[PDB]
Each structure stands twice: as structure tokens, then as C-alpha cells.
Amino acid sequence: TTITEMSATIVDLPSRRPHKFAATTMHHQSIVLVRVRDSDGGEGIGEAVTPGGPWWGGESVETIKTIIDQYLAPVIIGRDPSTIGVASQSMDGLVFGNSVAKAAIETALWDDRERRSRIPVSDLLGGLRRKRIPITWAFSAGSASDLIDEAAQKLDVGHRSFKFKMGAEPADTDSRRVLDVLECIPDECAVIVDPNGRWSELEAHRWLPILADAGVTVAEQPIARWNTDGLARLRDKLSIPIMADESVTTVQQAIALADAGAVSAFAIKIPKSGGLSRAREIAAIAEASGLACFGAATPESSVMGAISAQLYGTMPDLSVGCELFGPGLLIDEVVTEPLKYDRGELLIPTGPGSGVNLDEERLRKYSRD
């Protein structure tokens, strides 16, 4: 039994509202959908996804396709579908980095596995430890006006956990904006703030404590990804914990941080770690070193969101919470059944493989020209 075909198709997905990060605003969602067909007719799907282009991690849907088609494909076509380990090491041997590219393949491979065996990947991992996850709602960098009307409404549906996306505008304007919205958020809530590593060490130390005073509960990647020391000084001064996101993309980084004592938590995410196995390993290192985990978002459609949801359900710790709200914000998808939410909670897919299936009409419909 061998892998027979693998296609990588760029898909654009209509999105319910624009999503402004530090270096772009996202007007729709863009993924590469990977497909792996095997010798006796079984199929797996993976997704490559990015927070609106190469600003975050240097990968783009356009270049992802190419790396997959041209440089990765050769170690996947004709291979034994069950040898995901060797396929991952093969890919590393031909291409440095390009983790979002590797993630979509490694992940499609696991989906294939789950479906050949007729079980959810979460089994292959040792089984779910929870069936539902509470979702952390992430506000866009929009105005404080819009967000007070959005907060009040999401508190409604049931969320008690929030994230403010930051870094699109100077520290000082940005923090006033956020302090504004925090006025109409109950004291009891979790609030992460995520400047996407765009703040200076000076700005971080100026504004974080002011925001912690106003109820901000966690600081996600406040300063640059390589500034381990600065992160460590912050972790000491601050009354609130610091989470690595951009700073943890590999198991080696996990270790370096853990023991430089540079952060309080990991944001765990498949694409950025180059797949399901590596993502768990990073979380295993959090466990081994007593750091918390967050079920983080890229964001992604229901394809990657589903395998992620299963991951996060196998994980021993998501004390920081989970932000898998992304799919909820898409108006359409390439799956037959997108992720189901309820009263502000994700229900973990249980179907075989990743737990979601292609809809080939939608795929065709939303393929990019």
C-alpha cells in the first residue's frame, strides 16, 4: 500500500468579518488544501494556513503550494502511508523550515491513518481527555466602539474568556483602546493581549502593568521572538504570566525557553510546529517543565481546526484555554460539516481521521483561479 497522488490547491474562504493583525488586516481566509490518495482508494486531507500572509512566519499560500508540489512531494508519492515518522524526517532532510507546508502533509497523513483504521486521530494519540473545550474569543484590532458591542454580545452566547489582538498602532493609543473595552468586561474573565511581538521592551514594561491592573490576565508574545532575555525580565517584573507563541515553534525552542525560565506558557498550534507529532512534543515539554498550555489558533478553517481540536482534547493541560473560534467566523468551508460550537464551546470532532470530510463541490467552488 503506497501513496498514489497528492494535490495542493489554494482555497479562498469567505469570512464573516475582517481580521486586523499587526502587519495586515485579513479580508478572507486562504489555505492550501492538501490531499493524499492511497493505492486502495483512501484519502486524507490537510490544511496549510497562515495568519494572512508571510508577515508572521515567512510562509504564504502561494509558496506553500510550490514547496509541497515540487520539493516535498518526492518523499510522499510512492511511500508507505503508515510511515509518518520517516515521511517527516524525509521532509526535514529536503527542506529546512517550511513548517506550515510540512504540517499540511504530516496532518493529511494522520487523517488518512484515522480513516483507514476507521477511528479519530485522538485515539492514535491515547484518547480524548475532554469532549468539549471552552473557546477564547479574539477581538480584532478594530475600534473600541465596535468591540464593546461585540464583547457584550459574545458574553451573551457564553464566553468568559477573551483575547485582544494588538500591535497595529502605537503602544499608547493601542492600550487606551484596549482599556476602553475592558471597562465593559467583567472582572472575573480571562483576558490575553497579543501584540504579536511588535512591542519594545520599554513599551512592554510601560503598558503591560497598566493593562494587568485593568484586568488583562496573560500577555502573549509581547516582545520580539528572539528576545529570550527580555521575555525573562518581563516574566519577573509582571504580576501576570507571559505566553510564548512566535517564540515556540520547535521542540528545541521549547527547551531553551523552559530553562532560561523565560515564559509562563506555550501557545500550542499545529501549523507553526510543522505538524501533529511535534505539536504534542512541545506540549510534552510544557508538562515536563511545568508551563501551562493554550490551545492556540492560526487561525484555520475547519480542516486544520478539527485535527487541532482533537490534539487539544488529548492534551493534559489547556489551563490558559483554547482559541479555536476561527472556523466559527467562516461563512463557508471545504468540509461537509464544520466545527460545531455551543454556548461558547467547541465540541471535539469524533468521526474517523481528523473527523471532517471533504466537500468536493465546495473545494471546486472556492479554489482560487
- The residue among 252 and 367 lying less far from a copy of itself, judged by its C-beta, is 252
323 assigned to active site: yes
Kindly state the cell numbers that stand for 156: 451573551
- The residue among 95 and 358 lying less far from a copy of itself, judged by its C-beta, is 95
- The residue among 181 and 279 lying less far from a copy of itself, judged by its C-beta, is 279
- Cα 195 → chain centroid: 16
CA–CA gap between residue 340 and residue 27 (Å, rounded): 23
Other Cβ atoms less than 10 A from the Cβ of 85: the count is 10
246 is in an annotated binding site: yes
Q: Given 165, 203, 269, 300, which residue is catalytic?
A: 165
Q: Given 47, 59, 323, 333, which residue is catalytic?
A: 323
Among 19, 113, 159, 269, binds a copy of itself (CB under 8 A): 113
245 is in an annotated binding site: yes
340 assigned to active site: no
**Residue 179: which of Mn ion, a copy of itself, none does it interact with, CB under 5 to 8 A by kind?**
none
Angle subtended at Cα 179 by Cα 214 and Cα 319, rounded to the nearest 5 degrees: 55
Among 2, 157, 173, 226, binds a copy of itself (CB under 8 A): 226
Using CB under 8 A as the binding rule, whether residue 212 contacts a copy of itself is answered as no
Using CB under 8 A as the binding rule, whether residue 341 contacts a copy of itself is answered as no
Question: Which residues contact Mn ion (rule: CB under 5 A)?
Answer: 194, 220, 245
Name the one residue in this structure whose C-alpha cell is 493593562.
Answer: 211
Total site size for a copy of itself, rule CB under 8 A: 81
Among 42, 44, 57, 295, binds a copy of itself (CB under 8 A): 57
Per CB under 8 A, contacts with a copy of itself among 81-110 are 82-86, 88-89, 93-98
Using CB under 8 A as the binding rule, whether residue 350 contacts a copy of itself is answered as no
Question: Using CB under 8 A as the criterion, what x/- string covers residues 276-305 for binding a copy of itself?
Answer: -x---x--xx-xxxxxx-------------
Catalytic sites, residue numbers: 165, 323
Q: Which residue ranges make up the annotated binding site for Mn(2+)? A: 194, 220, 245-246
Q: Which residue ranges make up the annotated binding site? A: 194, 220, 245-246
